[PDB]
Write a protein that binds this ligand. Structure first.
Ligand SMILES: [Mg+2]
Ligand SMILES: [Mg+2]
Lengths: 217, 109, 110, 116, 45
RNA sequence: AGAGUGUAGCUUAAAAGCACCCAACUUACACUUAGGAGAUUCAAUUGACGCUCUGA
């Protein structure tokens, strides 16, 4: 059969910031402190705060509070980095800091002779190169950078075939350790998309189901 | 160099086979290890002998071995078996022939 | 060599008098016991999500090696092979802030 | 008895297995023993994530030999726990690894280091 | 879902108070670690 | 568009039994003990809401 040979790749950006908690979990958190405090056994912080002040009351009837004052001021001194570097930008969809809590995936625009399809990153292949080698080549053709992506195995993840002459696309999985994404305002249309906008850019039935094999969290 | 080993035979094994009529206290089968386990109306001595408790007819059957939970050796052999596995052992029963007594007319008072 | 740190410290015996007061009222025990049930239903839902994304993706990935089996008999005998690059595997977890500005990198360390 | 059809009805040692390199022979390719090192400075965060990968393996029928720990280093003590895994298929290799990736709580680092 | 095995408890019996001390390793990596005498701001060069 | 159809995860169960979730003893798993959430797709054996596939 005439096979148009297409290999492809969804990259998975690991989230660098842990998710905020849920209203039941913060009660599940604050309950988990109180039972832990009740089952603790005489820390030296409360030994030098409760046993001393009885004896400091003893010399006056005949300090640890100044220590804890030094620990509130440095907690307020060195201010925190932004967990949300998202609400300020809200339109920089090319940014690697587009969403810090979620899973992000490369997604660009390609143009065909008959189709104008927003696409997950693809490439043509030849049986001379291995399939894990095609996904190795996709890291540095359309991205034009010095990224460090990590594959796990050689097995595919998602297989949707469409015919015009026949064709198959093969979606593989990688993960960036770091990335030297030079010229992030490239000539392309790369968007890092969590989950809900993947149902917004990829409409047809062989592209509206990429979300079935990316990690849901 | 090989001295010892002049022990006689124990003469153990089945004394009353299948279908034999057996009174209470008759030793059914003497054994060295648990070859036959006791069943209905059959007791065990200290030396694993099987004596009969009622007057009846000896039957040998195969049923499911469920050991006692305090018998930690066999329970740790039970909990290594696969999920459909069922153990079986040969049991010795006595089917009691007589009833335990009748109601006889003593006197019209 | 069998040396560990599971051993309970000797200092955590003597002065066990710091909380001889373990008491709650009725309603504090009521609201906690409602929380343990609502968290019992919560993690049942969260592991129901992961039992979906494991099963459904394995459905797609076994149908992928079913599709790459039929349409290329020389290429599904190589997708089964193992990459020799996962032997020194290591990955940090997530954080609160992606790192910082430039500097200030200070502690006396002793 | 031997001559009866009920011979061997009570035998059981064939239901009990009373008594490693990378096993990739012809198609059935599987790893050897694995080790999963998890280091964190919280005993609460290291002990509790050692449970979940063990609960993830038990729910997927992956054989866990040891789940021991190596002792701490006084930097502040870093607690390290080892979770021994054997046997992953081709489809299982990426999927079983990515869920332990997608559940790392707070700054704990993974490992797929091996024996010795 | 990086909140799975972080909702925890010291499963020992002889243990002291453990305070949610925020630690930075070298670069602005604020990580909550239970540590005695609550500093709320820890760092290493 | 057509076919297969459809009890919570599974059931030659008929509102069931196993699987399943948390807590405590366990390094942990396991066991056990305390708790937890569950369904017959709606309308009269029949028809039309949902899923699987073969198509454009
Ligand atoms: Mg002899
Ligand atoms: Mg003799």
């Amino acid at each position: 059969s005439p096979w148009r040979l297409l290999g492809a790749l969804c990259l998975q950006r690991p989230p660098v910031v842990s998710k905020p908690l849920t209203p039941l979990q913060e009660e599940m958190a604050s309950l988990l402190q109180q039972i832990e405090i009740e089952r603790s056994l005489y820390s030296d912080h409360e030994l030098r705060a409760l046993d001393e002040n009885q004896r400091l009351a003893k010399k006056k009837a005949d300090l640890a509070q100044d220590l804890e004052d030094m620990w509130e001021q440095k907690f307020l001194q060195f201010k925190l980095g932004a967990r949300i570097t998202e609400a300020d930008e809200k339109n920089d969809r090319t940014s690697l800091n587009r969403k810090l809590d979620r899973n992000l995936v490369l997604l660009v625009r390609e143009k065909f002779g008959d189709q104008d399809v927003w696409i997950l990153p693809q490439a043509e292949w030849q049986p001379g190169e291995t399939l894990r080698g095609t996904a190795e080549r996709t890291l540095a053709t359309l991205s034009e950078n010095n990224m460090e992506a990590k594959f796990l195995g050689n097995a595919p993840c998602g297989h949707y075939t469409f015919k015009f002459l026949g064709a198959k696309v093969f979606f593989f999985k990688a993960l960036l350790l770091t990335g030297d994404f030079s010229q992030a305002g490239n000539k392309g249309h790369h968007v890092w998309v969590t989950k809900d906008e993947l149902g917004d850019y990829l409409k047809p039935k062989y592209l509206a189901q990429v979300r079935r094999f990316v990690s849901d969290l | 160099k090989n001295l010892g080993g002049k022990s006689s035979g124990r003469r153990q094994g089945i004394k009353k086979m299948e279908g034999h009529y057996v009174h209470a206290g008759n030793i059914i089968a003497t054994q060295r290890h648990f070859r036959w386990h006791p069943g209905a109306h059959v007791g065990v001595g200290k030396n694993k002998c099987l004596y009969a408790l009622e007057e009846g007819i000896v039957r040998y059957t195969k049923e499911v071995y469920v050991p006692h939970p305090r018998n930690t050796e066999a329970v740790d052999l039970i909990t290594r078996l696969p999920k459909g596995a069922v153990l079986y052992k040969t049991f010795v029963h006595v089917v009691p022939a007589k009833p335990e007594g009748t109601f006889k007319l003593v006197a019209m008072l | 060599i069998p040396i560990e740190d599971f051993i309970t410290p000797l200092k955590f015996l003597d002065k066990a008098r710091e909380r001889p007061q373990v008491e709650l009222t009725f309603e504090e025990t009521e609201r906690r016991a409602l929380l343990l049930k609502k968290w019992s239903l919560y993690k049942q839902q969260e592991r129901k999500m992961e039992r979906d994304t494991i099963r459904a993706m394995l459905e797609a990935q076994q149908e992928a090696l079913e599709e790459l089996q039929l349409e290329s008999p020389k290429l599904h005998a190589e997708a089964i092979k193992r990459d020799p690059n996962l032997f020194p595997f290591e990955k940090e977890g997530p954080h609160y802030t992606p790192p910082i500005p430039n500097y200030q990198p200070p502690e006396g360390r002793y | 008895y031997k001559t009866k059809p009920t011979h061997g009805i009570g035998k059981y040692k064939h239901l009990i297995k009373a008594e490693v390199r990378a096993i990739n022979l012809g198609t059935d390719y599987e790893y050897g023993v694995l080790n999963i090192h998890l280091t964190a400075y919280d005993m609460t965060l290291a002990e509790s994530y050692a449970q979940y990968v063990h609960n993830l393996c038990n729910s997927l029928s992956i054989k866990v030999e040891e789940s021991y720990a190596m002792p701490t280093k006084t930097i502040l003590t870093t607690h390290e726990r080892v979770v021994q895994i054997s046997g992953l298929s081709a489809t299982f290799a990426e999927i079983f690894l990515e869920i332990i990736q997608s559940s790392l709580p707070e700054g704990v680092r993974l490992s797929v280091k091996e024996h010795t | 879902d990086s909140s799975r095995a972080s909702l925890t408890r010291v499963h020992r019996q002889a243990y002291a108070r453990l305070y949610p001390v925020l630690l930075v390793k070298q670069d602005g990596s604020t990580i909550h670690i239970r540590y005695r005498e609550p500093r709320r701001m820890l760092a290493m060069p």
